[PDB]
Amino acid sequence: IMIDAASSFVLPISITKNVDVLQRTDEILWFRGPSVIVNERIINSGDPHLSLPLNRNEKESLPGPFVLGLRPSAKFTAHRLSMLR
């Protein structure tokens, strides 16, 4: 198991004409491995569909992942904006 590997490669031909959305050096960084997509960094460990209680085949499509993201209500945000000035 090695730690001090390079894991970064840049092609010498500069085709930096229409490339401004990627991660530039400031050239294009090319890794040895792909990227990973994480939807929400917070996990609601309640919400008993995930915790599976032992009391009582059912399908249910919940609206959006934001149930599992601890999203606050807009009234507290409006109250904090009223407390801002």
């Binding site: 792909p34 990973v36 569909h49």
Partner: protein, 147 residues
């Protein structure tokens, strides 16, 4: 745009696990998950500790310019089984499947494959082509096996 460049063949592709991985361990909260690209649903089923994930690729509306896909697997799941549902076997469709360099013929329309993986990244080149009509289609699955 590749919406006019969609696939004619390759209706259904699967990346399910074989039955030996369940037989050698077991002898469930199933959560199906879909993307906002109108196809390629993805279902899995953990319980209170294995998953038995399944990667469904319904290529009825998927483009042909986007051949390769990328995901990540656990080190406990090293075996895979591919279930290729095509349109019809009217001709001799050449369906060869290589992981990196070694091709796998079959396991024995509905064709079943057997895939044995190792650590690291994987290519998994698969293709379908005819002898008469001269129409080819490609599929790649960048499998990231964790150490």
């Amino acid at each position: 745009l590749g919406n006019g460049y969609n696939r004619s063949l390759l209706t259904e592709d699967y990346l399910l696990n074989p039955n030996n991985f369940k037989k050698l361990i077991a002898k469930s909260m199933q959560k199906e998950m879909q993307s906002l690209s109108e196809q390629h649903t993805m279902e899995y089923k953990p319980y209170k500790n294995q998953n038995w994930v399944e990667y469904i690729f319904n290529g009825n509306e998927l483009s042909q310019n986007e051949n390769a896909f990328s995901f990540m697997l656990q080190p406990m799941q090293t075996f895979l089984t591919l279930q290729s549902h095509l349109t019809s076997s009217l001709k001799d469709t050449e369906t060869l499947l290589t992981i990196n360099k070694e091709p796998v013929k079959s396991r024995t329309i509905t064709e079943i494959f057997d895939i044995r993986l190792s650590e690291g990244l994987n290519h998994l080149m698969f293709r379908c082509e005819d002898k008469i009509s001269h129409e080819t289609e490609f599929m790649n699955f960048w499998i990231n096996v964790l150490p």
